[PDB]
Every structure is written in structure tokens, then in C-alpha cells.
Ligand binder design. Sequence first.
Ligand SMILES: [Mg+2]
Lengths: 230, 188, 278, 118, 54, 137, 136
Amino acid sequence: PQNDYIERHIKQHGKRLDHEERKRKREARESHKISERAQKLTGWKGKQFAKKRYAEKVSMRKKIKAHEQSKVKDALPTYLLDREQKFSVPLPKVRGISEEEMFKVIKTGKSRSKSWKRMITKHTFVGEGFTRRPVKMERIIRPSALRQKKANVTHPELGVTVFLPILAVKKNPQSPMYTQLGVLTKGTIIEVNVSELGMVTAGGKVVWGKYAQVTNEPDRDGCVNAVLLV
Amino acid sequence: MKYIQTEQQIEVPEGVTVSIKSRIVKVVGPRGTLTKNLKHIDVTFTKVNNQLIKVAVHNGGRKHVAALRTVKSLVDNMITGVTKGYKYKMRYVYAHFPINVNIVEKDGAKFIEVRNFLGDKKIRNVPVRDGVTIEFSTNVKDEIVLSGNSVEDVSQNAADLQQICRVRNKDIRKFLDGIYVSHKGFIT
Amino acid sequence: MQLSWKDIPTVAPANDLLDIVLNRTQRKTPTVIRPGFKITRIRAFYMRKVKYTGEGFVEKFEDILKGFPNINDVHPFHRDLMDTLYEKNHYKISLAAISRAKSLVEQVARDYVRLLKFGQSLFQCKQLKRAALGRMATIVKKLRDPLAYLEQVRQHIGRLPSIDPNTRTLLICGYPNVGKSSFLRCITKSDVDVQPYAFTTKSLYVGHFDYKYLRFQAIDTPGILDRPTEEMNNIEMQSIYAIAHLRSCVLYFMDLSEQCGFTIEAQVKLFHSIKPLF
Amino acid sequence: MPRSKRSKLVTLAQTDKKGRENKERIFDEVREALDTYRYVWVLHLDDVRTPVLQEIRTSWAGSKLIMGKRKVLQKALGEKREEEYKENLYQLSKLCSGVTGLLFTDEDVNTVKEYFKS
Amino acid sequence: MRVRKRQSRRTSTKLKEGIKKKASAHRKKEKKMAKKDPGIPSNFPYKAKILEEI
Amino acid sequence: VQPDRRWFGNTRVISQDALQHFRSALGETQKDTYQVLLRRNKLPMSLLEEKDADESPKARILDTESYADAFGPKAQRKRPRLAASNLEDLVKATNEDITKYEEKQVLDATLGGNQEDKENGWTSAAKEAIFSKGQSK
Amino acid sequence: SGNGAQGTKFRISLGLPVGAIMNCADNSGARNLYIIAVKGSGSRLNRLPAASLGDMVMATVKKGKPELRKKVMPAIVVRQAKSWRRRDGVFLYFEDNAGVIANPKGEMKGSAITGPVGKECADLWPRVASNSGVVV
RNA sequence: AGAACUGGCGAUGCGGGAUGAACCGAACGUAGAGUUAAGGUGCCGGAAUACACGCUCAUCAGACACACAAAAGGUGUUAGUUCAUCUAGACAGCCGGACGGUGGCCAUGGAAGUCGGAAUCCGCUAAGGAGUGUGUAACAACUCACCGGCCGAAUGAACUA
RNA sequence: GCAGUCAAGCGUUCAGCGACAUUGCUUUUGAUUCUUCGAUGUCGGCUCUUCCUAUCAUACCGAAGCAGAAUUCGGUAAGCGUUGGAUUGUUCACCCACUAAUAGGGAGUAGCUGGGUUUAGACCGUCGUGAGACAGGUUAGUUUACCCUACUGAU
Ligand SMILES: [Mg+2]
């Protein structure tokens, strides 16, 4: 131990007498083994084998193309080189969300026959001073687990995307009563803290906030994605 | 495309004769005789000049042509074994525990006995197949020579002899003890 | 722990680890659920799947973290050896990255379980479970290089020598090929190359012997040159720090023959230069 | 072969087959040397170390040694009298059997033969 | 030796109707999405005659 | 959704003078326990934070040398980086470090009582569930 | 048999189920041992693990020195009090069941053992026999 | 999903698709003879184990809807399309060369083509790439791209069905 | 998930679609995690039979720095096993004791069941001017067979 003992043993004693023949025969048989596996594997193992074969073939083709290319043979400053980088909304006419969905009837009392309550089962922004009211007064319920604070906004320019706090919701289509509720409901326009991106308009009036539109459905995702409206 | 007919040529040396039945092939020569039942192959034989035999398959497919080729190869191997014979040399290597090899006899089976392999107390007996003779080499320390007329029998015996000494559960990168086929050649 | 940290659990690369975890989650847990089942059943099934995946990833990361020797505050000699061999900065950075990935996986699993507890449809729960699995897969994929580096360093550390500094040990010093390996082989039973080429031993070699019923261990080292330590290889630094940290009594070997073409004057100059360590 | 066929061992080597272009070039060179030099010799060197071949080539800078495929050299020298490049050149081409081998030089025949003997 | 279960090949006409409806929908979807020569073959012994006629 | 110049409109633009005033106020203002906050007056706090510091966290060493370069089959890191410039400095920094490590080990061993479990092989009994309250979900 | 025990052990009556209390038979200061688990016990539905003479068990000190409280340590039963068939052809039992606390290697903590020590336990545990002044 | 047109079922028997509200056939009095639809002609089951060309060996094919799993992968098979080399000896098999400037420049304990970074320049050829891979601390040695010598004739590469 | 690069390919007639890879996303020094935020609906257990492998262990093997011990993954493998317990100021889990192991799932079971649907009782808070119910909470409150089949035995 305490060293490359296997290497020293090989250099002093060598491999097995049939080791070379065994390795050569296994290498020769590898083609038949691959062919048999391509036809015998089942139970989703065939899917993985086919995917790996596809990846290997693509990699080999790309390597061959690169080798052939080798055999054939914007104006950044010195301190920035060798470094990494109509008024229509991007998503008009979003799918309409029914009023029956997103409002789960919640039943209360020993005899659950006076529900009178509604729960919003979609992500919503509830401001900074939310402070739930008494139980007897609250009708619409938005669980805290569904309350989002920071939204992922992608900059159309520079291809850079940053995680920024949500400021407010301005225009949610489909009965903007939901806008008042603050539901995201992909297709909504929300204010975002653009201060991080350092956008400055003419006149020295640095912009720390701007509009943005959510591009992903938060119902089926654990994150909020939006496209910055430059 | 189901070729109309494909044939191959088998060369029979003057020193041996090969009588063939419907599909049973018998080879006779100085060293001995061999037989093989090829009734499952469905091929035809035909003499031309008493020294060459042509095996042909009419309306045979690619697989049938391959079977014809392997039949020709088997016939050639049998002829070579009958004429020259085959000689297999096997060497056993040990690091600490010497390997004791002896040809014991019980009821005429003539098992090959290997003892003290890697210090194991178990006695390994490898039966000797028909038509193959095993003799310990002389002037080549730690070597055993297997000879016979049939390639299949000698090869299977050598494979079994080397496999019976399998190193189980130990790192093959360190334990080099075992039995290996050092060289394959003809008796002549 | 100390003394031959050989029992570190092997760690597979990022791709292999992710594949193993996903296969285990798919196999051990049930995979059959139907839309006709109550929404509670589907929610429980998907939450259980996500929790199982998170638990598997957490267990793997915890095992990897525990296995390693925790280079900090182990021992000056062992700590310095690890720093010289595995680039202690990079080793600590990789292990901290693994620990951070573990916490990220825990947070992702908890958040996704909380979100999925409010699931309202089979498709929504399936999408949430897929999102959690994809987040875990991306976190694992981000760990590609550190896992590969840690596998190699784990192999090396398992194959490293295990000397006890507190014990009475010998140490051989001098120019390469002066006879350090030969002396170690002769004095005690050990497997060390005794070839005459420049650097026969590329690392430390240990050999035990008994004198007057007391256990002793001899240590052989590649050796050092007349360099002023401003520029030096890790091989020479290993010997330098072994001399510095170890209480061992050091023996300075010399060869007056034409071999070891650093003349007697060079040997004496090296001895004088290393005198502070002596 | 629809399937179950041999697979070529593809390797990313830098050299590529010269093709028929090299053969045509050697053919033209042989036909030019047949008239550019006063004497022609057929050298049967089955195998030789490349340094030895270069030493032989540089032994006389005032001469040219042509080698390559035997068939190409034979065709350049002519296979029949009906198309031989030079009179009786078919006879010389008929004599090549080994790994030839075609030396063109204006040096004295006796000197060349003595050098080859020594 | 301990062969496992085999998938039944029975038609299960409920599946017949389901597949018929699915195919009818798919054909309509494909139709809606729709709105939104090799020359002389080789190996022919008399391919030259085509060029002569041209 | 109807197109408009808003949404691509400017809403919350701030001026430099206001930013400077708020930055000064952050360090000037102090809180009083007898007074409680009612409104935070939504502000770009990001542009006002990042006060002066003198730490300069450790540089990204991985960028200069990757994991493979530090160690592996290639292992181009043939020499230690910034190692002690002299043998005397190495001895001075190692002899005292050994004593410090011994003192730290003694201090840690003063507590261990896991040593009894390690030696005698016994283990502490399971913590009673009653002592885990009130910490339920 | 398990670690520490030497040789094979023949089955005897199991008179010490989990949760049983047996008087301490060593001078370590413990008074009685509360058995929480039995080493080498079988796995079966609804079957409570049970110990016997010479078996190694994990038990907590219900009474005795405060230092020994709240911690579970291995113990070896020296008395059973339940009749068991000896191969010699006699059924015997002790006045009261008792055990001695020991380490996983079977080493004795107390320097002496009080009261009779079962023959099976003494034979199966060399350290117990060496620390036993009375056997049977 | 919202509409317009067009049939059936409801109120509908009968033969077929094993079994059926929508599928095919089809004009419902009681009878005799004959010819047919759709479906079938190895038995249950009335009718050719009929004739002719091919396609498939499946360690749970096939007789399964035409639609989701479905993008592809098989040194499993049959037939085709497009490009290449070829008696100026086609592919594959055996033996020889695989040079010299040269151990090319940076670091180096060791780095000679094959641990790492920029080059990757030129002479002689039939050919030699500052090197395709195995291995030595270091070369050495083995081997490949190509070429050369022996037999000889079709062979190779990508796609379609 | 969204926002981008490349194209093995498809192709308004070969501008558009597009496989495998790939960048931004959600404190680099194992340091902490003292967040653990609404499931309006139950789950969890006593006896007991069978079945699936997507195999925890036993059986046979390959690949792993597999020197040993020991450990990881993978191939076949359901023949046999997969346990004794604390916790309801909750128990959609959990800890520690052994054992080779304490793997995941279906048939569920008016056979028994504790939480839950709970009915005229009763006690504290909210609403309402009231009858009363609720955001709560606490508490006291049919049931087979001798008929047929199914199974175990017997003429
Ligand atoms: Mg040496």
C-alpha cells in the first residue's frame, strides 16, 4: 500500500499470461455484445441504450467533422476582450383561465355545508403589508406557500437574466379582478426592480424599476419567469 | 438472393482417406481416426479426383453458405488433426503456494488432479476427454502438454482445466496464480 | 480520524451519481398512479417520490462529506501533506461546493414539497415533481468537476502512507540515489525501488522494525536539492515538511563516489542549508 | 451487405491516400527521365533501410533514382514493342521482377557497375 | 423457466373506439396544421440512348 | 392584451440627488424603540446598500487553475504556490503550529464524554419524546 | 453466539424477555439492569426478544451509581431463575435472575462477581469464569 | 370549445366483425327452388391444408384498431438510390520502409512524437504525420496514415424501401 | 421553466422547423439551517391468503485503486426471510435495539376497529338586535347464514 503498489507489482510481475489475449478477445467481441444489447435490452433499459448510442454517434460525427476541418488548413477594448458577455407584448392572447378553476371551495364548520370560502390555488403577489385579517372576515384565501417575492426576468439584450424582486402587478387579463388579487397567471405584466441591471435613461435619471411580463405558468413550475419589456 | 449453387473445395492429402455417408463424415489416417455427425447441416459431398472433395449447396442462402464454409473448415481441421495432430501446452503459475498437478485414475476416468491451488484444501478433478492424452513436460518447468487428434476435445479439456482454477472474489490485478494455455501447435 | 483514512466511500461522477439516484428513486418507490385516484393520493405519491429523491441525494452528499478526513485541524504533518498533494485550497473549495449543493438540494426539495401539497390536478403534480427532479439534476450536473477531482484525491489519500508522528521514527535525507531506498530496504522489510535513476521514490515510503522490544518505523523520502526553496517541486516540499513537522530523528546520507554527481562540496552545502531543519 | 458487415477502423490520422495522381506523376517523371538521361538501370532492392536508400540516392547528386509500384514503372518503360517509349525498351521493362527500382544517370557504365559491386 | 405474464392481444373494442376517435381528431389537427425529379436512374445499360434522344 | 407605449413605459425612475440623499440618511438616521414603523416608503435599497468594507473576499482561485490542473493525471501544479520563502520561516511557522495543535487537542479532549462510549462501548439512551416539545409541526 | 462469546451455545429456556429487570451480579456499583434489547435475538412477528443464561444483552442501569444512569451498556446474564434442561440430565434453576455488565468484547467491568454463576455462562465467557468465584 | 349542412340511432329486425347504439352488408307477410352482399374456405365452422411471386425465426413475431408512447438504435434480414478505388493489380489477408534538419521551441528532477503550452517550418522519396495508439522516469520497443512486396477482381462509404 | 449559441437533419422551390450538446439564472474554504406558513380532506392497526420486480438480504457473476478486510454500481434471480419498541400540547412521520436484511407495491377486507363524516345533550369565543350556526375548541352518545355457492374435514 501507501504507493502505486499495483503499478509496481505489474512492473515487477506483469499481468496474467492470458490477460492480453483475454483483453483482445473482449475488444473484438465488443461489437457483437453491443449488437446483442441493442436488441435484447428491455424495461426502459433499451431506451437508455438507444439514447447513449445516439449521443455517442453524434459525438463521433462532430469529432470527425472537427478533425476534417483542422486538416483543411464586437470590437471590445483591451480590458474587456477574453471575457464573457409595434408595441405588442411578447405573449398576447394567452389561454383563458376558467373562473371555476383557481377557486377551490373550502368548507368550514362541524357540518361542512356553509363553505362561503374561496382559495386561490395559483401563485400571487400580496405586497409588503399583507397582514392577514381575522378568519371570520377573510373570504378569498391565498396560501403563503404560493406567495412569490422574487421573479426571474430575462433581459432581451445581452442575453443576461437576473433574479429580481417583484414590485407590483399592474395588468392581469381575464377579469383583472385577479390583477387586484395580484395573481401571476402567465400573460400578466408586473413591475420589477431593474436597479440591478443598471438601466439609465437620458438625463442621468437612473431607472430602478420597469415593467415585465411573466412568461411561464407558475402553477406547474416552482419559479417565475418573465421577459423584460425594454 | 438465394444463389443457385455455391461450393467449396476440400483438399484430402494422399496419406489419409475420408469415407462419407449421407451426412456422416469419417477420416482415417496414420495418427488415428475421427468421426462427426453432420446430419443437421443438410449439405452434399462429391468426389472429383480421389484427392479433392467439393461440398456444394444448391439454392442456399447466406446462412447456408456460411454453414457450408464452417463444414469445410471442420473437415480441414479433422484432416489436419489426423495427419499432423494438435499439441496444446499449458503452464501453471503460482506465487506462494505451489500447485501440485497429478493424473489420478479412478474407474478408468483418468481425472487430472490439481491440489494446493492458492492454498485451497479442496481437490479439483478435471476429467480427461476421449482421444486426448496429457503428459507433463520435461526441461520446461511448470508446464503440462495436452495432445490429441480432435481439436474440439483438446480445446475443451484445456478450457476446463484453466477454468477449474478460477480466482474467485480476489483482485485479478494482484493474484496472478492460475493455469493458462501457453502455446498452441501441432504434434509434428 | 487519522492513520490510513482508507474507508472513504467511493463517489461516482456527477452523471453516474445522478443516474444512480434517479434509478433508485424510480425502482424503490411505486410508479403507478391514475387520474381516477383521489387528488390526495396523487399528491402524496408525488411528494413521496420527491422526498425520496431528495433523501437519496442528501445521503450521498453527507456520506461524501463525512468520509473525507476534514483536513482542517487534523495534524500539521497530515494537513501539510494533503495541502501539498491535493492543493488544499481546491480540495476545500470542492468539498464546500458539495456541502452547498447538499443544502441547495434540501431547500429545493422542501420548497417543492410545500408547493406540491397544494396540487389541484394530476398534470400539475406531475409537472411539479418533474420540476423538482430537474432542479436536483441540474444541481448535480453543476458538480461535475468537483466530483471527478474528489474521486482521484480520495483514491490517492486511501493509497497514501499512514505514519504516526507521535511515535519514534527514523528519517533518511540526502541527495537522490545516495542510497536512501537501499538503506530503507536493508534496515526494515519494505517494498521500495532501488534503481539508480534520478528520483527512484516519488513519495514517502514507510518501513517498520523492532529494536530492544520497541516498535520503530523508518521513513524514506525522495530528497531535496540545493535550491533555496524559492522554487521547488511538490516532491521536494514533501520531504522538507516531513523533516520539519516530524519529531523523527533525521539521518543525512552522503555518497562520496563519482555517482550522485552533486559533489561532496554540494552535499555539504545542502547539509548546511538544511541545518535549520536539523 | 445489408447488415452484419465489416466495420472500418476509423482513426483521425493526418495523412491521406495519394491516389492515382501520384502514379500519374511518377509515370510522367519516368517518361521524362527516359529521354533526359543517357543510361537507364533496373535496381532490384527487395528491402532496404530508408537511411541506406537516401545514402545511395545522394551517392551521386548528378543522377536520378525512380522507384514505386512495379506496374507503373513497367508501363512507363512500355509493356510491348508496339508501345515502348524507346526502341527495345520493352526488353528492359520485362526484366524487372523484384521491388524496383529505376535509376537514370549519365555516368560511365563501368564506374556504376564497379560502385554497385563494391 | 418461471415465465412471467404475457400481454393479452384481445381487441377490447373500447380501445377500438378510443383509437378511432383519437385518429379522427389527429387527422383534423394535421389538416388544420397543413394550412399554416431524380432524372435518369444509374446502372441502366442503355442510359446513353436517353442522352442521344435529348 | 392591447399594445401600448406603457409596458415599455417608464414608471419608477429615480434621480442621482435623491439616491445621494437616501444614502446619507441611511447612515444618519437612527431607530428609537418608542417609535414603530408604519410604512417602508418603497425605495431602491439596492443602490443605497454596499457600504464601505475592507475584507475583499478570497479571489476565485479556480479561475486561474482548474480542478484538473491542481491534481489528477496531468497535475501541472508541479510546485507549491506562495510557499514559505525560507527554511527558517517554515521552521518558525511549523514548530509553534505543532504546539498550538497540541494545545487545541488538549482543550478538545478536556470535554471529549464520548470517550466513555468509545472505550466501554456503551451508548446514551434515546432522548424522550416529551423533551422535544413544543416543537411539533 | 456473537462477538466475544467463544464457541457455540446450545439453546436453553429464555426467561429474560425485553423489559425485564435483573439484579446486578458485579461490584461495578449497579443495582439492577433493565433489559431493552437482546443481542443475537430472532426476528419474528409479535415475538418479543428474550435472553437466557450466558446471552449478551443491552440493558440500562435503573438504580445504582448516578454515572451509570441514562446510558445503555452490554450485559451478560449469569442467572436465569427459569428451569432449563441441562444435557447432563437435570433441570435446574437459580434463586434469582441476575446479570453482569460487560463491554462488546466480553471483558468484565467489575473486579468480582457475587453469587453463583451459571455453568453455561462461565463456559461461554472466559472472562466471566475468571471473574467468578462461585460456579453453580 | 362555439356554429351551419348532411345521416343513423330513438321506434330496428336479419347476416357478418368471437362478444356491441352507432362498424360493413341490407326494401322484415307465410312458403318452395335458385343467385348473391359483407364476412370466410385447417377444426369448432357451411367452403380449396387451392394455384403463382416474394417477404419474417421473434427466449411470449404475426393475424391489433392507422391513432400516444414513435426520435432513433441491430456485425438481424430482402430489394433499391447516390458517391468512390480497379490488371497504370479493386477490398481484405502475410512481410519491409515508416527517414534525415531533429532529441524542432516553452517550462523540467525525468518530457527524445505519445504528462503539459504556442508553433506544427523544410530536404528525399513510393512514403513518412514535430506523430495515430500500447509502454518506459528517459529514451528503447511495439504499432498506425501512407507506401512498398505475395495471391487475385470486384470492393468500400452514406442513405431509401 | 423561461431567455440565448450550433446545427446531424427537415426544408416558402433547397426564408422557416429542428435531434444530441451548450450559457444566465433559483455566502466558493464541508461554515452554518435555531423555515417547520393554510393538504377542508383523511389515515393507521388486529388476524390472515395470494401476486409483481422497479432485488434490502441469501445464491451465481462482471466492472470499480478490488493489496486484504471492507465498500460502490451493474447482470440474472421472487425459492425463502424483510423484526421487538418510545412519541397525539399530531403520528401525511419519526427516532434506537438486534439481525444477513429490516425493499417498494395490488387484491382490498360492515370480521373488529381508534381518529371522521356525528343526528335531539352539555360548556368557552365569533357573528347576528333574534331564532341559530360557525375560524375554533372540549365533552357524553342491526348486530347474518339455519338458504345457495366459496373453503377445511366426513359418509
Ligand atoms: Mg534510488
